[PDB]
């Protein structure tokens, strides 16, 4: 078995287990701010930021045909403090090719380049999308499962609990090809679920980077916080 | 689309939208005690109780071949007051042929009559299993997805938060055939997930009853409470 795992119950500035990209900072109090917070505490528009675990992850091996099962968990808050215009754009857990740099922002969430469906992306993602783009369902926020496209293969509306912490569980079972995600708000007790078939052998490269990305919007004050308080991950590739 | 749904935020005695079977009772405080609680407040062993919603559910159609999607949610608690003997046996949400009566108790949970994998059972169930029988994985408690057999096709160990309230979400999406179940403990924030492919056409009759069942064990003090505080359900059959 090729097993890999990590776990941050909080973040600490400077620990090179994490590559920070774009606007992402780790505060002194241990919070990963994916998108820029101005000095008055308000979230800035036109901001993109990501973080990746600095170690590659073996997900499948094109010599044995085995596929790795895996699971990630994290806690985040999105606060939408502006009365106008509508908030944007969201945050996302993603798995893609290694050594990746941030892509386009706004509705592509720092992960995609366009609204194309394109096997060249080689990227799996679970999004928490706060702005309804032309390729989106009308309901926001929504969870979505993104396979080689910002146009999710499956979505699920959820109600924001503005500024509260949400717990996320994301799990892939290789044998059934099921990818599931759950969002829980302790503040309210609300529980949301989503699941779809995903053949990661046909999507992901053998090795992948895993990461979190956030983005705010393309006009002034179309913005929200994308703060992350903890992040764990476990992958296990059978022989 | 053919639609049915219900939602009990608490339970009220004498309401005949619910059928109580075996030991099941509704207290004056709105709690559904699936298995018997003695006058001294301790749970009684050798006890089996169930509740069924009193309207059948149209889950699929042989002529059109359409299959309903559905979701159920409930809050329960299991209190295990003794450490010797081991507590038993558990509770379960189940879907099966109409007009059914309690089957065997103990590790069969009031739903099955023995351990065989038999298509004549015509029963689908999500179990919360507290005692490790010969057909069970060694870890208890565990969530299990039971398709025509108390021998689960898929299990997920979880840690009991003894005596505290758990929140369950179970969802079936017809197009993917994914059956998913989530357990959340608000007291601790723990989250557990389980999912598997189920084709309910090969499993269930076209019309089913839905219900809840609990059972305590086969020797003195091998017992635990099986209390349920709320229960909702929704199904939608395309047309
Ligand atoms: C777990 O075991 C339980 C106990 O066995 C099952 O419940 C019993 O299920 C049987 C049906 O298989 C019920 O018996 C029938 O009762 C009806 C109504 O009176 C009779 O008409 C019927 O008899 C006819 O069919 C028989 C063959 O099935 C023929 O042999 C017979 O000639 C008739 O043509 C049958 O009655 C029995 O006939 C044989 C006699 O020797 C016997 O004495 C007589 O009872 C039975 O009433 C029922 N018991 C209870 C407490 O409910 C249970 O089955 C599930 O629920 C029942 C109601 C049905 O819906 C089953 O399809 C269903 O599986 C089973 N539970 C599970 C999940 O397997
Ligand atoms: C997404 O955008 C990036 C940047 O434009 C693309 O990456 C460049 O792609 C070409 C060919 O793949 C390379 O020559 C460049 O060196 C790449 N730049 C970097 C930083 O890697 C990427 O290919 C685009 N992907 C899609 C699907 O459009
Ligand atoms: C001033 C103005 O109307 N600008 C709009 C952009 O806002 C808009 O881009 C979108 O902006 C929203 C937030 O408002 C969000 O960030 C979307 O992801 C982003 O695409 C654009 C739409 O094509 O039109 C501009 O004129
Ligand atoms: C006295 C004694 O050991 N009796 C045992 C039964 O307890 C046992 O049944 C199992 O008991 C546990 C709880 O103790 C649980 O209820 C199981 O579901 C049940 O099957 C049985 C096992 O074959 O043997 C008796 O002798
Ligand atoms: Ca969007
Ligand atoms: Ca058992
Ligand atoms: Mn979206
Ligand atoms: Mn079991
Ligand atoms: Na309690």
């Amino acid at each position: 078995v090729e097993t890999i795992s990590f776990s941050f119950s909080e973040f600490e500035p400077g620990n090179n287990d994490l590559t920070l990209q774009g606007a992402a900072i780790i505060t002194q109090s241990g919070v990963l701010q994916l998108t820029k917070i101005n000095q008055n505490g308000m979230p800035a528009w036109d901001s993109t930021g990501r973080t990746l675990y600095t170690k590659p992850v073996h997900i499948w091996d094109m010599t044995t045909g085995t596929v790795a099962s895996f699971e990630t968990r994290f806690s985040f808050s999105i606060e939408q403090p502006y009365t106008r215009p509508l908030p944007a754009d969201g945050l996302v857990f993603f798995m893609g090719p290694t050594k990746s740099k941030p892509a386009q922002g706004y509705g592509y969430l720092g992960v995609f380049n366009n609204s194309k469906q394109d096997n060249s992306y080689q990227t799996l993602a679970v999004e928490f999308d706060t702005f309804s783009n032309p390729w989106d369902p009308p309901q926001v926020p929504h969870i979505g499962i993104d396979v080689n496209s910002i146009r999710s293969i499956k979505t699920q509306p959820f109600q924001l609990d503005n500024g509260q912490v949400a717990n996320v569980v994301i799990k892939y079972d290789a044998s059934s090809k099921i990818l599931l995600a759950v969002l829980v708000y302790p503040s309210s007790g609300a529980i949301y679920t989503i699941a779809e078939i995903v053949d990661v052998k046909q999507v992901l490269p053998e090795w992948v980077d895993v990461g979190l990305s956030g983005a705010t919007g393309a006009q002034r004050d179309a913005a929200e916080t994308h703060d992350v308080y903890s992040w764990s991950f476990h992958a296990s590739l059978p022989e």
Side-chain angles (χ1 to χ4, degrees), chain A:
Chain A
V1 168
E2 187 158 353
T3 279
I4 196 168
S5 62
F6 67 79
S7 187
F8 304 91
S9 56
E10 50 165 50
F11 303 95
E12 51 155 324
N15 159 252
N16 304 336
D17 277 84
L18 293 186
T19 312
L20 309 179
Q21 302 177 323
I25 73 169
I26 299 184
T27 67
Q28 281 210 336
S29 66
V31 174
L32 171 74
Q33 299 180 330
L34 291 169
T35 61
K36 197 216 218 300
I37 306 308
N38 292 336
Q39 278 179 232
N40 72 334
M42 299 297 270
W45 67 293
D46 214 354
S47 184
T48 308
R50 328 195 311 173
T51 179
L52 320 167
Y53 197 53
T54 62
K55 283 206 271 282
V57 177
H58 210 144
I59 290 295
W60 65 287
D61 209 73
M62 209 182 192
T63 69
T64 39
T66 67
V67 178
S69 288
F70 65 87
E71 164 180 22
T72 185
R73 309 195 171 211
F74 53 92
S75 299
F76 76 85
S77 63
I78 290 175
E79 191 184 348
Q80 296 176 345
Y82 297 114
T83 301
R84 35 192 61 91
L86 294 181
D89 268 285
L91 60 83
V92 56
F93 168 81
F94 66 102
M95 305 166 69
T98 68
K99 305 197 162 314
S100 83
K101 296 295 175 174
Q104 294 305 102
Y106 309 148
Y108 311 119
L109 306 179
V111 178
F112 299 99
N113 286 355
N114 49 45
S115 64
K116 300 188 185 189
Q117 304 162 335
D118 196 340
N119 308 100
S120 177
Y121 278 121
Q122 300 200 110
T123 287
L124 204 185
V126 179
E127 62 171 42
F128 303 83
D129 188 350
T130 57
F131 181 93
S132 183
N133 294 101
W135 57 81
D136 276 328
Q139 299 86 4
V140 284
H142 55 263
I143 318 158
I145 295 171
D146 302 349
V147 184
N148 283 326
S149 183
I150 197 62
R151 188 182 312 268
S152 314
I153 63 169
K154 182 90 174 183
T155 57
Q156 166 68 47
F158 70 96
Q159 270 206 5
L160 198 74
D161 197 4
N162 194 5
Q164 307 295 333
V165 182
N167 301 328
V168 173
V169 182
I170 294 169
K171 206 177 133 206
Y172 184 73
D173 299 295
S175 51
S176 65
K177 297 173 160 55
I178 294 175
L179 178 68
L180 71 73
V182 179
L183 185 145
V184 177
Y185 269 118
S187 52
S188 66
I191 301 165
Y192 302 92
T193 64
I194 191 178
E196 188 51 271
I197 298 296
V198 179
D199 186 5
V200 290
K201 212 198 266 304
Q202 290 261 285
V203 177
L204 295 178
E206 298 180 323
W207 292 81
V208 295
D209 279 359
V210 303
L212 310 171
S213 178
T216 54
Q219 63 178 89
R220 184 166 284 100
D221 289 350
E224 72 205 351
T225 66
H226 307 90
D227 301 332
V228 183
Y229 305 94
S230 69
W231 185 25
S232 68
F233 179 92
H234 187 72
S236 41
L237 181 51
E239 307 275 331

